[PDB]
Scaffold this active site. Structure first.
Site, PDB file in Angstrom:
ATOM      1  N   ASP A   1     -40.210  33.746  30.688  1.00 25.06           N
ATOM      2  CA  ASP A   1     -41.124  34.424  30.166  1.00 25.06           C
ATOM      3  C   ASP A   1     -42.195  35.072  31.160  1.00 25.06           C
ATOM      4  O   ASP A   1     -42.901  34.461  31.651  1.00 25.06           O
ATOM      5  CB  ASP A   1     -42.071  33.471  29.253  1.00 25.06           C
ATOM      6  CG  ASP A   1     -42.937  34.074  28.573  1.00 25.06           C
ATOM      7  OD1 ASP A   1     -43.024  35.342  28.358  1.00 25.06           O
ATOM      8  OD2 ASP A   1     -43.774  33.322  27.747  1.00 25.06           O
TER       9      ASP A   1
ATOM     10  N   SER B   1     -46.801  53.158  30.932  1.00 24.94           N
ATOM     11  CA  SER B   1     -46.047  54.254  30.454  1.00 24.94           C
ATOM     12  C   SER B   1     -46.458  55.567  30.422  1.00 24.94           C
ATOM     13  O   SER B   1     -47.507  55.681  30.184  1.00 24.94           O
ATOM     14  CB  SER B   1     -45.139  53.850  29.274  1.00 24.94           C
ATOM     15  OG  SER B   1     -44.184  54.804  28.772  1.00 24.94           O
TER      16      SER B   1
END
Length: 330
Positions: free
Chosen positions: A35, A199
């Site tokens: 994770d 992004s």
């Protein structure tokens, strides 16, 4: 040193991925959910409340000659999905794919919430976010990666998750055969303890690319892709019959649909998520309403590039003095 381990989806939907991890002496192999959005290595154990164990493999520290109680240390964690666990702490030898760390904090669960109990395939979590998020008190502990880093040939790990197929976590090297083209690296903020990056935009299907900054985290422990409501609405508007359902808890779509791809930007590069990766199947057994793999982050407080996004790429988690993230197509 290096390590290399195969990671395997837990079910036919890729709800999560499990990777075998050796703990203790002799080895006890547990299947852990790696994770990159948390920083605790915790396991089902011989200390876990018996009624909360249902099929998991447990770690039994009393059977490990290298286990040592970390006296006074406790831990307690809550995840974005509302699940939680807590317990005490041992140090022991932990190996992943041939890479060994001695003295790793292994957090033994005394209590786990129902979602963990109900998932027989996940024996615990191995956190790979920054150690500043580790919950051990009163002495915060380091992640497996942080402990291994100095010994690694290169201070990196990579995630190569499969679509409905196994994939690979590598530590200490970049497998140049595992991706196509080049790796595009992008800046990371560690201010919130995550692999947080920005992004450069998105496209829906064959549509034009929209240049827009989207801050979010690369999180292998989250199944879906969670993005701003504007972006998510633009995606689902291209699927006939798709709608946001408050009763279901997100966007659903007719299972008869063919889903468009979704592209996200990494610098000037582009990662394409095929439409099929966005299908999470019937909302309930036999239903013709299917659950979408792109959902709104509104009310989470952060955008999350979870498995839906990451499995479309070869992803480098670069733990150099200034960390960065790399993405390549594959």
């Amino acid at each position: 040193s290096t390590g290399s381990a195969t990671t395997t989806p837990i079910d036919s939907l890729d709800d999560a991925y499990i990777t075998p991890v050796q703990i203790g002496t002799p080895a006890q192999t547990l299947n852990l959910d790696f994770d990159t959005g948390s920083s605790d290595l915790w396991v089902f154990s011989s200390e876990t409340t018996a009624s909360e164990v249902d099929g998991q493999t447990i770690y039994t520290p009393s059977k490990s000659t290298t286990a040592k109680l970390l006296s006074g240390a406790t831990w307690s964690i809550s995840y974005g999905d509302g699940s939680s666990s807590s317990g005490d702490v041992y140090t022991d030898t932990v190996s992943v794919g041939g890479l060994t760390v001695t003295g790793q904090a292994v957090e033994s669960a005394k209590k786990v919430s129902s979602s963990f109990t109900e998932d027989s395939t996940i024996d615990g979590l191995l956190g790979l976010a920054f150690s500043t998020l580790n919950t051990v008190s009163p002495t915060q502990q380091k992640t497996f990666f942080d402990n291994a880093k100095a010994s690694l040939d290169s201070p990196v790990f990579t995630a190569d998750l499969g679509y409905h197929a196994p994939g690979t976590y590598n530590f200490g090297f970049i497998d140049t055969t595992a991706y196509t083209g080049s790796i595009t690296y992008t800046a990371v903020s560690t201010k919130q303890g995550f692999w947080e990056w920005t992004s450069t935009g998105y496209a829906v299907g064959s549509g034009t690319f929209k240049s827009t900054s989207i801050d979010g985290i690369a999180d292998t422990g989250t199944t879906l892709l969670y993005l701003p409501a504007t972006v998510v609405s633009a995606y689902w508007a291209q699927v006939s019959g798709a709608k946001s359902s408050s009763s279901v808890g997100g966007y659903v779509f007719p299972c008869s649909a063919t889903l468009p791809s979704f592209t996200f930007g990494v610098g000037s590069a582009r990662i394409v998520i095929p439409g099929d990766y966005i299908d999470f199947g019937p909302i309930s057994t036999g239903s013709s309403s299917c659950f979408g793999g792109i959902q709104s982050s509104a009310g989470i407080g952060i955008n999350i590039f979870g498995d839906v996004a990451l499995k479309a790429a070869f992803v480098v988690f670069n733990g150099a003095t200034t960390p960065t993230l790399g993405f390549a197509s594959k």
